[PDB]
RNA sequence: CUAAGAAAUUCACGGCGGGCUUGAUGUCCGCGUCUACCUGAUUCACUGCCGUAUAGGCAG
């Protein structure tokens, strides 16, 4: 999109900038189901590669009345002190163009047992023998840590900013603001 | 370039027999331990779905 809006976090002495990031990562998620639409992305400028940092930025991606109605929200509401805002801007020109998707792992081999045993009336035995405990993929990704609405698990969302392209393509994204096809612009 | 330079201790073996340690006993007065704290560092790598798949994706 053209217009893009920078929440940075306030240094709190009570909180680390992880638990905020996911607390606003959450209250954001909500908010992108309270509107709906597949027209939002999210981006993190001061991103670190070498130490899986997030940095303090999220810089959220839509049209200009999207970010004026998410200004006004209640899903702001309690996080106005750990946070300040910009203001909606356009976006700057020349910028490289990159993808926002969660990438999730097979990180907990008896869970695919258990979908084994679900899908091929197996055994234990015959699960541990077809998924061995070496199928266990560790991610050198930043993440935030959720928590479910729906059921009642937390999970860390990881996530990878991909490669940087000269131009941006049609897709649209989910209610996380990530690339289910989409594309933001990287500055 | 060393008080340098060298070196086979080893064959066999019955330690056992016997025994009353005993009497007696006042530990004991007295006592101000206080003061003040972030356990949270992403610290719950989870649950499930599509797929024949462990290959690869997805959902919260």
Not at 117 to 137: C, F, G, N, Q, Y
């Given at each position: 999109?053209?217009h893009y809006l920078?929440?940075?976090?306030?240094?709190?002495?009570?909180?680390?900038?992880?638990?905020?990031?996911?607390?606003?990562?959450?209250?954001?998620?909500?908010?992108?189901?309270?509107?709906?639409?597949?027209?939002?992305?999210?981006?993190?400028?001061?991103?670190?590669?070498?130490?899986?940092?997030?940095?303090?930025?999220?810089r959220?991606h839509?049209?200009?009345?999207?970010?004026?109605?998410?200004?006004?929200?209640?899903?702001?509401?309690?996080?106005?002190?750990?946070?300040?805002?910009?203001?909606?801007?356009?976006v700057?020109?020349?910028?490289?163009?990159?993808?926002?998707?969660?990438?999730?792992?097979?990180?907990?081999?008896?869970?695919?047992?258990?979908?084994?045993?679900?899908?091929?009336?197996?055994?234990?035995?015959?699960?541990?023998?077809?998924?061995?405990?070496?199928?266990?993929?560790?991610?050198?990704?930043?993440?935030?840590?959720?928590?479910?609405?729906?059921?009642?698990?937390?999970?860390?969302?990881?996530?990878?900013?991909?490669?940087?392209?000269?131009?941006?393509?049609?897709?649209?994204?989910?209610?996380?603001?990530?690339?289910?096809?989409?594309?933001?612009?990287?500055?």
């Amino acid at each position: 999109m053209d217009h893009y809006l920078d929440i940075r976090l306030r240094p709190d002495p009570e909180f680390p900038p992880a638990q905020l990031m996911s607390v606003l990562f959450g209250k954001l998620h909500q908010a992108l189901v309270a509107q709906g639409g597949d027209r939002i992305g999210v981006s993190f400028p001061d991103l670190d590669e070498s130490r899986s940092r997030l940095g303090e930025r999220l810089r959220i991606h839509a049209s200009a009345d999207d970010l004026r109605a998410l200004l006004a929200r209640p899903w702001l509401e309690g996080l106005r002190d750990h946070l300040q805002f910009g203001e909606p801007a356009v976006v700057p020109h020349p910028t490289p163009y990159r993808q926002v998707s969660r990438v999730q792992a097979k990180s907990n081999p008896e869970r695919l047992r258990r979908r084994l045993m679900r899908r091929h009336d197996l055994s234990e035995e015959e699960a541990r023998k077809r998924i061995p405990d070496t199928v266990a993929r560790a991610l050198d990704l930043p993440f935030v840590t959720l928590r479910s609405q729906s059921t009642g698990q937390h999970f860390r969302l990881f996530i990878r900013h991909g490669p940087l392209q000269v131009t941006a393509e049609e897709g649209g994204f989910t209610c996380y603001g990530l690339s289910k096809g989409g594309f933001v612009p990287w500055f």
